Symmetry: C3
Subunit: 112 residues, 3 copies
């Protein structure tokens, strides 16, 4: 099992969710983050230090998938979330050691 974490442009959430649904992915968890990178927000200089005054929101998508699914999922997300412009974001894949569905106590692949 793999945890697929994608940091994407907020306006790409709907498109990514449809891609996952097409693969029959049953659910996912989403949170708000701020992004720092080559694309930067505006700053105001005070005493030699530049205070950030604008920020770039991103959406963090976390979806647990089986090993047999993960490559297809990463592919779908990349294609859905791509604009070709700077700031498009990242996909990080983390190994999951165990998964449990709280409602049933089902483990691993049967928990998703």
């Amino acid at each position: 099992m793999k945890l697929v974490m994608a940091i994407i442009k907020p306006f790409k959430l709907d498109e990514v969710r449809e891609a996952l649904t097409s693969l029959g992915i049953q659910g996912l968890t989403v949170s708000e983050v701020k992004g720092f990178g080559r694309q930067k927000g505006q700053t105001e200089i005070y005493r030699g230090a530049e205070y950030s005054v604008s920020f770039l929101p991103k959406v963090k998508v976390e979806v647990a998938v089986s090993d047999d699914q993960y490559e297809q999922v990463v592919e779908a997300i990349q294609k859905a979330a791509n604009t070709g412009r700077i700031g498009d974001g990242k996909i990080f894949v983390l190994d999951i050691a165990q998964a449990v569905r709280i409602r049933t106590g089902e483990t691993n692949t049967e928990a998703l």
Copy 2:
């Protein structure tokens, strides 16, 4: 060491925290997320596309525990966070490669 990530119903946070305290777990980190899954929010259809108009908040609990603790922790959380109804959520266990307490520089199990 393991990072135990639980996605739970917001009204179950207090109950989960008490369970962890009973195990002598010293601390944990909590964030707000939105959940998508078999339980769905309401949508409004515009031009063939259904815009989500209601969302289902969940709370993401992240607690780092020692290998000797992790199975007990996962068990406690599952029992505390369970309602038996759809939407109860998931527990994902991730391996931790290193941990540091910022205040002391203590490493691994002594950092918790």
Copy 3:
């Protein structure tokens, strides 16, 4: 590749970001969390149960770095985020199985 996750005092974000920039780290992702631990917020007791009425915000910094960088990054963060007072937070290092830059499709170390 490693995902370095740091839970830090909010007023330490600027200092940590400068440390990473000094190492030539190109970007990072930041989110808001609440912290529970030895430092606690205030509570109000109702029917034997203590409702939390104040909370301690922390900032979660997540930065993916190469294996050759990770020890230096963990060191920089620890020194930047340290106050010596309780509540300073934690750094957890997670192994990354794969990384992709969404804009280019570049993989692993070339994605950062």
